Amino acid sequence: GLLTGDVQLHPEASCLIMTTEILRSMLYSGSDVIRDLEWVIFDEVHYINDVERG
Amino acid sequence: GDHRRIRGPEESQPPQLYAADEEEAPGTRDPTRLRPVYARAGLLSQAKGSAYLEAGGTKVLCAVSGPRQAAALRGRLLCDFRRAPFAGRRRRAPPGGCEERELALALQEALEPAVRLGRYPRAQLEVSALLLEDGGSALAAALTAAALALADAGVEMYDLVVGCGLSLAPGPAPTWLLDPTRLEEERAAAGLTVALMPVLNQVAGLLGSGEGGLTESWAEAVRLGLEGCQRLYPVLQQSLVRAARRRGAAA
Amino acid sequence: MKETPLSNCERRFLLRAIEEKKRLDGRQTYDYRNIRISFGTDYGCCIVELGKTRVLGQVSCELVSPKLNRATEGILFFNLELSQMAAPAFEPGRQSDLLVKLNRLMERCLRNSKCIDTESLCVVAGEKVWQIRVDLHLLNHDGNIIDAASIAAIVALCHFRRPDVSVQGDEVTLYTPEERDPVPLSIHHMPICVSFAFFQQGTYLLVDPNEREERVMDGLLVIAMNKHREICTIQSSGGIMLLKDQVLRCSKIAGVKVAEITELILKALENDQKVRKEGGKFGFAESIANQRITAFKMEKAPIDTSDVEEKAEEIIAEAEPPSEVVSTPVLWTPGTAQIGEGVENSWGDLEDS
Amino acid sequence: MAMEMRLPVARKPLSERLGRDTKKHLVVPGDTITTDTGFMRGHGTYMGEEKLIASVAGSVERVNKLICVKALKTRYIGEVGDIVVGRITEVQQKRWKVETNSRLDSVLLLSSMNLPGGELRRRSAEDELAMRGFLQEGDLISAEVQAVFSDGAVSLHTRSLKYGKLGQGVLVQVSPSLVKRQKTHFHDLPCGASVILGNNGFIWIYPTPEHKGGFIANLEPVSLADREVISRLRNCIISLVTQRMMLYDTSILYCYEASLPHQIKDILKPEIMEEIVMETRQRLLEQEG
Amino acid sequence: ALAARPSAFASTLCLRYPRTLDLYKTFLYSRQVEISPLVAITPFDFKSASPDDIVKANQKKAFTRE
Amino acid sequence: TLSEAEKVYIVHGVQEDLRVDGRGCEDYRCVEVETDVVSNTSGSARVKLGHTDILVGVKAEMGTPKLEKPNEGYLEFFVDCSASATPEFEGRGGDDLGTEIANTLYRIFNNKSSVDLKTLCISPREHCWVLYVDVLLLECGGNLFDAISIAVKAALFNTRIPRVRVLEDEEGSKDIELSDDPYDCIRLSVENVPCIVTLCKIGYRHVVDATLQEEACSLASLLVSVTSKGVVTCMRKVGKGSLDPESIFEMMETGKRVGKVLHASLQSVVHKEESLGPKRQKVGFL
Amino acid sequence: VRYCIPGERLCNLEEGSPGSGTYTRHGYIFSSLAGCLMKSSENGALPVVSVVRETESQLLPDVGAIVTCKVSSINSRFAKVHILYVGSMPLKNSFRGTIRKEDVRATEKDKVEIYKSFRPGDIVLAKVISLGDAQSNYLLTTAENELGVVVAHSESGIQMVPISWCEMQCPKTHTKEFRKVARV
Amino acid sequence: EPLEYYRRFLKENCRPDGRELGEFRTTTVNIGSISTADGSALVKLGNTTVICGVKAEFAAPSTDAPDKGYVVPNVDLPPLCSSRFRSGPPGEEAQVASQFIADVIENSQIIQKEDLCISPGKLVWVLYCDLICLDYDGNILDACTFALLAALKNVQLPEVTINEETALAEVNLKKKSYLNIRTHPVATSFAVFDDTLLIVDPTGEEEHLATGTLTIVMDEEGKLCCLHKPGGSGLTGAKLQDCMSRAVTRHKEVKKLMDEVIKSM
Amino acid sequence: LELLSDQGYRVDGRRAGELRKIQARMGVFAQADGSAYIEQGNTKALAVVYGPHEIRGSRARALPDRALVNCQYSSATFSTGERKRRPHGDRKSCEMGLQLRQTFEAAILTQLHPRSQIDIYVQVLQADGGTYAACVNAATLAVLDAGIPMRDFVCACSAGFVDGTALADLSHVEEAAGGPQLALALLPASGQIALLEMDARLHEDHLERVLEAAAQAARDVHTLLDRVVRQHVREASILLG
């Protein structure tokens, strides 16, 4: 599944690939997806130093 | 009147109200005797379970249907009491009666303390009892027979239900009598019927109303009712033995 | 089963029409669908057709004992009923909230107006008096059931003719149409219902609406008013919220319309009486249109009843006679006997003991 | 034991016992509220012809463009992030149905439930068979509303550690307008028991959980000194809720302390309630004021 | 507590209803009254693929996902 | 319905002589009986045992004696169950409960010495007085039997039975002539009218005046009909569980004592309400 | 041999263990049926005493049981059936059922068109999985190689024979149809 | 399976009951057991048990002909005799089983209502005969009719004499008379298979699989009272003439039964 | 019998355009969601309503656009001089409760409770005179007690016509005299009529005057019930704070 802002495909797939703001969007609410999460992996950790998105 | 039956006369007074023979005298007896009873199980062939009970002047036929579709986690127990119109002094209206519903409920609140409905989820059992003739204690027969029918139909119960009956003499020194008849019941002042589990030693149903107001007579009426329910048990003990011996030997 | 649902195109179509003040079948606002009456052969029986609705009315009387109190009058039952064939939806016990308002409309109109003379329907007092009992049936539902039912009841009651009796001293006697001529009834006035429908919150009204116009309407106003100038019942219902000038306009409309309807009814009853008195042929049979494909007429016909004797005789003669194995009855003890293959032993005894 | 039999007494109207004049604006249905150039209708009112017409009895409350009427008797309306208490009335294939004194039923989805185990083991169709086993008919939960549906229905979730099936105690049902909005609806009153003030009108009273999800049964006898406290709070809650008082922690603590002098069995009389409510009223007056 | 002997009505109510030449003649059955199949294999012995079993063992053994 | 944990807490409390309200295993909540509430009838009562609400009415009318005995009247009961009490009682559905209560009340009152029957006959075989007892359930809050057996004794205590002195002589005016006095009546001597006492059994203890929650935790119960004198009229067991012989004997003493205290206190309260007459006004439903 | 009545003293808790259709109380074993006394010694002593009538007129279905059924109607997403035999024995009455669109094959997969799986009039073998809701009461399953339609019936009233795992053919007219064939 | 299995016995000429396709079940009756009724009789037909009872009361004669005493039959099918009957008002099968008996009572003229009046125009006897089925196996209208006819031969009424000044009724309970019976209508039922097969004395399963049913009742002088054919396949004159030849023997059997049981007292 | 003397006084002593005395109460029951109690003259009514809830039976009988109003009617067996007990199958209760359902399906602003039921129960303890208007007013008060929004305060009153004059709030003695009775159900702010009834004959010229007198008597009932509602709301506002 792809949860990018301008393309939404198969939002119920086993594996979801999304931008970072989507993760906090589904973490503010319950969304009943956290119960079945085994691995969550980050691809670019060097944005902790980002001046506007860190 | 009724659009689902055959219409006859609008009114009909029975000849008993014109019967010129004055009411007779019942008589006397020993209050420590029981009318001999004969019991048969497995009578009907198309019913899952049935029994026919006859003792003296009482004739009652009970049949049990099996579980059907429709406190769940538990199954219901539907009941239906109905007596034949050709029973008693007068005729009775086919549509029904408040007396029939009261006795049906007095049956329902007495056969459920025996069976374990925690084994039939979402199911239900229906019990039908019919009184062909009223010649004595009736509620002491609609309990024994509907429990025998249940035991021969293969439903699981903790124990049986054995009923009895009593009545109070109208003399200046009243004394309770065992197994009263219509000649000793229409001339009585009070009556009592007990439903005892003989092995578990627990009373299942109680009903009594009348003119006896001292709380020392009812202790004997209750405990002689218990002695009656412990003395009727052996006949029902050999009746289910014969019923199972014949059913098994029929294979 | 249920009725076909209503689309969202028909609602729009009826409402653009109604706004423009033109209806489907051509009739303008203040019009009726023309009427057509037909009489049976025995008295108190008629068939009315308003537009495409049908109602069958039939009156019949009978002699009973007059309750307790009101010892010098007679009783008058009524029982409306809705026939499964009137429309798909009508079902014997699933439309119990229209039957009540309909029976009520009919009974309040006919019995509270005091047009029938139930004074002079006695024979003795405290003893047998005539108990009439009207009966109407709905045959085909096309809207405005109550106007048609009322006209039907009126005509059926104004066409009945009782039996007749001789009473003198303290002695009864009952005649028959050959011993004595049937007698008419006494009818003071003729209360006739009218209905109005309101559309899009009272802004428009339409006289005599049918069943489609009935599904695109808010509420109904009925106004029952006998001849002369005397109103007898009104019953607003449905979903309506009414003004006060409008009730008066409606009353005017019902006055005019009942005048015209009473003209028609009187003319039809007179013509029917003239026909019955001339000596011509009447009845349900001589009403079937002959200029129409679905009617056919055939005088009597002996078919050929020349052969039945022979066939029956040969059939009886040509078949096997009863056989002759006769069975025996067995006697157990007075009261019970058995016939058939029988049972081996005399009776069971100590079978299991 | 005497089975006292008193006689009914006529009620005194107008509340003259204290005496107050209201400065609010009161309306009844049909009244025409202010009809200025531009205003927005709230809940409790409707619009006719160039008119703002009140549709329910109450008092108008406006925040800077908004005319609305607040009725004094309604049913619970759901809002996001609101603590509720309910009971299971139907167990379906993929949901339960819970009654929380609302205009409809509330749905507890299987996707939102702390299953036994309390960790990441599995979630599959094997659990669907036993979901109807543990959450049976007539049980008590304590969950949090998740979202509002399109027909006034409410979906509630149990995604925490403080939520789940409740245990022993007593329940008192009142109208869902006497519970005061706060930020902590969970309380641990220093008396020997706790309480949850459900915003839907369900008040649950249970003893303190000793030290330290429905996994534990704890169906063992409760000490005598705990029942007397639960009964005292039950009677005090009935007393405070009845006349007017809005419910929260200090009022219940104040009345509990005020209820020590005389026995718990004898407080059912019309006057003993009055002599306690007035005392709590004046203690609140001498503390807040 | 003595049990008793039956009577007529009961002994008739409890009745069990359970070639020898020819009688009732008219009611016999004789007096009153090509197929080339080319059948396929008679059963299908399932000796073949049975997809469910395929896909299961397939994926479990395969265990690759690439 | 209530959960299993609540039932366990309640049964433990009952075994500890504590209940959620705070009373004991034998305490009895107060009631607010009253009389003379309805105008058109000839006797009234209004019993409020809690959340329940009862309202009855007695009307005496002319009638004909029955066939078996000519010097007697009879009593007709009809326990209506209004649908405003609970929504599931809408239309059909309150019939079985009403019939159950009416038949129980008939069994209670089906005796020769209930109140009297000589007083209600005026002319043998030709006329008699008839009494119409009309119970009307307004609300249900548990313990309905005692809340009705009290409103029946109360309404029976307030009957009028206007006296009629009409001579039966054929030469005289046989047609019933009243006394023409609008305020000339006669009492009814209801001193020994029985009442029902309910004793629910929870665990191995029996509790008087159980609430709906405390009733749902019980398995059986027994009903006893005792007069002021302390005599038994009817005895019916109602419930869904067995009872055991011993508990009958140990429940009879509590039934006797609660009945005697109930009857003495009802006589005291009715005499207190009656000591002052047309004063004190009458308040009900307003 | 001796028979039973649904209560009597049979054995102690040390002299055996309760079996099927029995209950125990106060250290004794009590009967709960009217059948025959069978004591399955098995292996390890202490026989598990039980009473069985062995003449089953009716038997309530369970969480797991093999039943023979008969389809009543089919829908695009479910198929109501009628339970006819509980394993082997005939049933005096008929209950109701529903086959959802997840229990056809043993994979719980997508596709699986219900229409060509359970055509009405057939007799099927299925397994229960639950006690169901008030809409669907027993929730039978056929997710196995041994479960499925066993004895079908032709379009014009001719006994059918299995021809493949997914395809069926008429023997008379050589017509091709689709079923869900179960192992014999 | 259903049709072919039974036709295996049909071609074998021995149906599963063990019968030759043209014979009746075993028949036995008892009379005079219920002592709370004027008359009663129990009929057993190898299952299909039916019991009848007669009660006599007083009633006012009708307004048209005040010289007739009513007789009212009713047939009831309780939910205990079978398992397809449900509680409530009587169903179609019991109502038809009652209308059939009423028609038989009227057409057969077994009794005359002028024999029940005591004093014309004021009071007449009324007989209430109610039939309750104890077992439904098939051929209901045959055993109900036989139960009714057997019961009517045992009902006995007491001699009632009316005073003149008192004008009341004094019942003489010692001298009890009997009833006058004219004819003896006995019914017989046939079940027709798909288009040609006819069997006698069918069974509930056979009626479940049959395609029609015929019933014929005969007098003691070879006169037909009713020809009850609810419908089905279709028959011919030859088949009816074959049926009546068997029905004559059945009627002789039944009339011998009644002629023998009553003499034994 | 004189029903109107030459001086103008009726049997009970009031003039033509004079109402009886009403004495109401709000908040009678506790278990229910609303209650009321009204005594219009010598007629005692009672009403109990239950708030929007789940539809009983759940037999797919809902309306996706509005709520389902369900009103019943019952009557005590001692409500008149004779006993006159009736079973719960009479057609008078059904038709009056059907007119009640008709007027409350028009007064209540029902398009705010989708998939919901409203159960309204009315109990008459003593009937002498107009029962319909007493039931309508008692159920309007009970609905107000329950907090259900409505367009206006619907109130009903009857009228009559004897000897060329129009009466108001007729009684049972006057009703059982064969006269042109007539009843409304008015919304005071707009003047609209929710239900109209009449019986027996009446000429068309006096319909305007009977209707006007009935509407005026309903507007006179409006003020008297309005003061009761205002006193109740001021009572609860005083209680609150």
Side-chain angles (χ1 to χ4, degrees), chain A residues 3 12-13 20 25-26 30 36-37 39 45 53-54:
Chain A
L3 288 179
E12 75 273 21
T20 187
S25 185
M26 294 323 93
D36 266 332
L37 61 83
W39 309 93
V45 181
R53 302 221 272 137

PDB file of all heavy atoms in Angstrom, chain A residues 3 12-13 20 25-26 30 36-37 39 45 53-54:
ATOM      1  N   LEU A   3       0.635   5.267   0.832  1.00  0.00           N
ATOM      2  CA  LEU A   3      -0.126   6.349   1.453  1.00  0.00           C
ATOM      3  C   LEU A   3       0.506   7.713   1.206  1.00  0.00           C
ATOM      4  O   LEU A   3       0.466   8.589   2.074  1.00  0.00           O
ATOM      5  CB  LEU A   3      -0.281   6.093   2.948  1.00  0.00           C
ATOM      6  CG  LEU A   3      -1.254   4.970   3.303  1.00  0.00           C
ATOM      7  CD1 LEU A   3      -1.313   4.767   4.808  1.00  0.00           C
ATOM      8  CD2 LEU A   3      -2.637   5.273   2.744  1.00  0.00           C
ATOM      9  N   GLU A  12      -5.364  -0.961   2.867  1.00  0.00           N
ATOM     10  CA  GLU A  12      -5.503  -2.061   3.813  1.00  0.00           C
ATOM     11  C   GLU A  12      -4.502  -3.181   3.562  1.00  0.00           C
ATOM     12  O   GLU A  12      -4.664  -4.279   4.107  1.00  0.00           O
ATOM     13  CB  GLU A  12      -6.932  -2.612   3.766  1.00  0.00           C
ATOM     14  CG  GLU A  12      -7.229  -3.452   2.533  1.00  0.00           C
ATOM     15  CD  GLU A  12      -7.689  -2.619   1.353  1.00  0.00           C
ATOM     16  OE1 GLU A  12      -7.404  -1.404   1.332  1.00  0.00           O
ATOM     17  OE2 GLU A  12      -8.333  -3.180   0.444  1.00  0.00           O
ATOM     18  N   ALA A  13      -3.463  -2.925   2.770  1.00  0.00           N
ATOM     19  CA  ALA A  13      -2.475  -3.942   2.451  1.00  0.00           C
ATOM     20  C   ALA A  13      -1.676  -4.317   3.700  1.00  0.00           C
ATOM     21  O   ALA A  13      -1.748  -3.661   4.742  1.00  0.00           O
ATOM     22  CB  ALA A  13      -1.541  -3.450   1.347  1.00  0.00           C
ATOM     23  N   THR A  20       6.377  10.705   6.274  1.00  0.00           N
ATOM     24  CA  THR A  20       6.492  10.717   7.732  1.00  0.00           C
ATOM     25  C   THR A  20       5.277  11.345   8.409  1.00  0.00           C
ATOM     26  O   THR A  20       4.847  10.868   9.466  1.00  0.00           O
ATOM     27  CB  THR A  20       7.786  11.421   8.154  1.00  0.00           C
ATOM     28  OG1 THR A  20       7.969  11.280   9.570  1.00  0.00           O
ATOM     29  CG2 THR A  20       7.773  12.900   7.780  1.00  0.00           C
ATOM     30  N   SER A  25       0.050  11.250  11.859  1.00  0.00           N
ATOM     31  CA  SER A  25      -1.387  11.422  11.693  1.00  0.00           C
ATOM     32  C   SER A  25      -2.129  10.193  12.204  1.00  0.00           C
ATOM     33  O   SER A  25      -3.177  10.316  12.848  1.00  0.00           O
ATOM     34  CB  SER A  25      -1.718  11.700  10.227  1.00  0.00           C
ATOM     35  OG  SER A  25      -3.097  11.981  10.067  1.00  0.00           O
ATOM     36  N   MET A  26      -1.602   8.997  11.926  1.00  0.00           N
ATOM     37  CA  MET A  26      -2.234   7.788  12.439  1.00  0.00           C
ATOM     38  C   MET A  26      -1.795   7.459  13.857  1.00  0.00           C
ATOM     39  O   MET A  26      -2.360   6.547  14.466  1.00  0.00           O
ATOM     40  CB  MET A  26      -1.902   6.569  11.565  1.00  0.00           C
ATOM     41  CG  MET A  26      -2.436   6.526  10.137  1.00  0.00           C
ATOM     42  SD  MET A  26      -4.078   7.205   9.874  1.00  0.00           S
ATOM     43  CE  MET A  26      -3.651   8.874   9.431  1.00  0.00           C
ATOM     44  N   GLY A  30      -6.179   6.475  17.162  1.00  0.00           N
ATOM     45  CA  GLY A  30      -5.920   5.072  17.390  1.00  0.00           C
ATOM     46  C   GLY A  30      -5.632   4.382  16.075  1.00  0.00           C
ATOM     47  O   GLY A  30      -4.535   3.857  15.865  1.00  0.00           O
ATOM     48  N   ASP A  36      -1.380  -4.487  15.306  1.00  0.00           N
ATOM     49  CA  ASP A  36      -0.759  -5.493  14.445  1.00  0.00           C
ATOM     50  C   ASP A  36       0.518  -5.005  13.770  1.00  0.00           C
ATOM     51  O   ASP A  36       0.792  -5.380  12.626  1.00  0.00           O
ATOM     52  CB  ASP A  36      -1.760  -5.967  13.397  1.00  0.00           C
ATOM     53  CG  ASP A  36      -2.502  -7.218  13.825  1.00  0.00           C
ATOM     54  OD1 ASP A  36      -1.937  -8.006  14.613  1.00  0.00           O
ATOM     55  OD2 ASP A  36      -3.648  -7.415  13.370  1.00  0.00           O
ATOM     56  N   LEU A  37       1.320  -4.173  14.427  1.00  0.00           N
ATOM     57  CA  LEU A  37       2.584  -3.712  13.863  1.00  0.00           C
ATOM     58  C   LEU A  37       3.729  -4.469  14.526  1.00  0.00           C
ATOM     59  O   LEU A  37       3.827  -4.506  15.757  1.00  0.00           O
ATOM     60  CB  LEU A  37       2.763  -2.197  13.990  1.00  0.00           C
ATOM     61  CG  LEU A  37       2.818  -1.414  15.301  1.00  0.00           C
ATOM     62  CD1 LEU A  37       4.191  -1.453  15.895  1.00  0.00           C
ATOM     63  CD2 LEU A  37       2.478   0.023  14.991  1.00  0.00           C
ATOM     64  N   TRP A  39       7.198  -4.469  12.815  1.00  0.00           N
ATOM     65  CA  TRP A  39       8.415  -3.739  12.488  1.00  0.00           C
ATOM     66  C   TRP A  39       8.055  -2.393  11.880  1.00  0.00           C
ATOM     67  O   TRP A  39       7.225  -2.322  10.973  1.00  0.00           O
ATOM     68  CB  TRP A  39       9.303  -4.535  11.528  1.00  0.00           C
ATOM     69  CG  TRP A  39       9.566  -5.931  11.976  1.00  0.00           C
ATOM     70  CD1 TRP A  39       8.861  -7.049  11.641  1.00  0.00           C
ATOM     71  CD2 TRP A  39      10.608  -6.362  12.856  1.00  0.00           C
ATOM     72  NE1 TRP A  39       9.405  -8.150  12.253  1.00  0.00           N
ATOM     73  CE2 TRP A  39      10.478  -7.754  13.005  1.00  0.00           C
ATOM     74  CE3 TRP A  39      11.642  -5.706  13.530  1.00  0.00           C
ATOM     75  CZ2 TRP A  39      11.341  -8.504  13.802  1.00  0.00           C
ATOM     76  CZ3 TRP A  39      12.497  -6.449  14.318  1.00  0.00           C
ATOM     77  CH2 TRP A  39      12.341  -7.832  14.448  1.00  0.00           C
ATOM     78  N   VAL A  45      17.085   9.045   8.683  1.00  0.00           N
ATOM     79  CA  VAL A  45      17.088   9.484  10.078  1.00  0.00           C
ATOM     80  C   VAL A  45      17.813  10.813  10.248  1.00  0.00           C
ATOM     81  O   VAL A  45      17.686  11.454  11.304  1.00  0.00           O
ATOM     82  CB  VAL A  45      17.718   8.371  10.947  1.00  0.00           C
ATOM     83  CG1 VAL A  45      17.738   8.737  12.431  1.00  0.00           C
ATOM     84  CG2 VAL A  45      16.995   7.049  10.729  1.00  0.00           C
ATOM     85  N   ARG A  53      11.260  20.335   9.754  1.00  0.00           N
ATOM     86  CA  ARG A  53      10.507  19.092   9.833  1.00  0.00           C
ATOM     87  C   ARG A  53      11.072  18.105  10.847  1.00  0.00           C
ATOM     88  O   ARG A  53      10.545  16.994  10.962  1.00  0.00           O
ATOM     89  CB  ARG A  53      10.430  18.424   8.452  1.00  0.00           C
ATOM     90  CG  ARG A  53       9.790  19.305   7.391  1.00  0.00           C
ATOM     91  CD  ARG A  53       8.847  18.529   6.483  1.00  0.00           C
ATOM     92  NE  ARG A  53       9.537  17.942   5.340  1.00  0.00           N
ATOM     93  CZ  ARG A  53       9.325  16.716   4.886  1.00  0.00           C
ATOM     94  NH1 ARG A  53       8.448  15.909   5.461  1.00  0.00           N
ATOM     95  NH2 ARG A  53      10.009  16.287   3.830  1.00  0.00           N
ATOM     96  N   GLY A  54      12.123  18.477  11.582  1.00  0.00           N
ATOM     97  CA  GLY A  54      12.756  17.541  12.497  1.00  0.00           C
ATOM     98  C   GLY A  54      11.881  17.098  13.652  1.00  0.00           C
ATOM     99  O   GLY A  54      11.995  15.960  14.118  1.00  0.00           O
TER     100      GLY A  54
END
